[PDB]
Amino acid sequence: SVQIVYKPVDLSKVTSKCGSLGNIHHKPGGGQVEVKSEKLDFKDRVQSKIGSLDNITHVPGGGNKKIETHKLTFR
Amino acid sequence: SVQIVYKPVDLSKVTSKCGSLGNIHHKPGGGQVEVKSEKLDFKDRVQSKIGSLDNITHVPGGGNKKIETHKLTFR
Amino acid sequence: SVQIVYKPVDLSKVTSKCGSLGNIHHKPGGGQVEVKSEKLDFKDRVQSKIGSLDNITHVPGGGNKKIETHKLTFR
């Protein structure tokens, strides 16, 4: 009754060729952060961040992604 | 009754060729952040960020994506 | 009645070729963070971060991802 064949071929080349990658300078600190508080009420759960947080300097010499989903579903 | 054949071919080349990538300078700090508060009420859950947060300097020498979804569904 | 064949081929090459990657400088500290508090009430669970947290300098000479999901489902 039925026959299925799933022959995807891939020969893809995601690629880069950088000569020279230099001299980044990220400076997310320095500033002053004053916070005062009086007579607060918190009747449910609370989160605070204060200061320099979660800062990033990401420098992949490469940095190349490739995603490739195959899916095949049958009833 | 039925026959299916799924022969996608791919020979794609996503590509780059940078000579020289330099001299970035990101400076999201420095500023002053004063915050005062009096007589607040919070009857549900609360989040605060204050200061320099979540700042990014991303510098892929490459930085090339390729997505390729195949899907195949049958009843 | 039924026959299935799942012959995905992959010859993909995600790739990079960086010459020289230098001279990053990330500086998320330095700043002053004053915090005062008086007469607070917290009727549920609370989280605080204060200062320099969770800061990152990530420098993969490579930094190349490849994801490849195959799935196959049958009723």
Next chain:
Amino acid sequence: SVQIVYKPVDLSKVTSKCGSLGNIHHKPGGGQVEVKSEKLDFKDRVQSKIGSLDNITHVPGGGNKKIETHKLTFR
């Protein structure tokens, strides 16, 4: 009686090849400078400098010198 012959040949190649030159920074006399004085006497020539003076940032992308003196003398 005489011959003289002066056939210097030169095929020299002074050369450079910088990729990326930057984020240079120079901050002379950030500081505060008081000078106070009472009851001075001067019976001769006076020179004063005060503050930031005569400061230099020189950044030749090249900066390549070649000097080549020829001389030839007879009595």
Next chain:
Amino acid sequence: SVQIVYKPVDLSKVTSKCGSLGNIHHKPGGGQVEVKSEKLDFKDRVQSKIGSLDNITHVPGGGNKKIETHKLTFR
């Protein structure tokens, strides 16, 4: 009677090849400078400098010298 022959050949190659040159930083006289004075006497020439002076940041991408003196003399 005489011959002289002066056939210097030069095929020298002074050379450089820097990838990336940067995040240089120079901060002369960050500090605070008081000078106080009472009841001075000077019977001759006076020179003063005070503060940040004569400071230098030199950054030749090249900076390659070649000197080559030829001389030839006769009596």
Next chain:
Amino acid sequence: SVQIVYKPVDLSKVTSKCGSLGNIHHKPGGGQVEVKSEKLDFKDRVQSKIGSLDNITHVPGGGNKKIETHKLTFR
């Protein structure tokens, strides 16, 4: 009677190949400088310097010298 022949050959190669040169930092006279004075007498020439002076940051990507003196003399 005479011959002289002066056939110096040169094929020298002074050379460099730096990848990445950076995050150099120079902080002369961070400190605080008081000078106080009372009841001085000077019967001759005076020179003073005070503060940050004459400071240098030299960063040649190259910095390659070649000197080559030829001389040839006759009586």
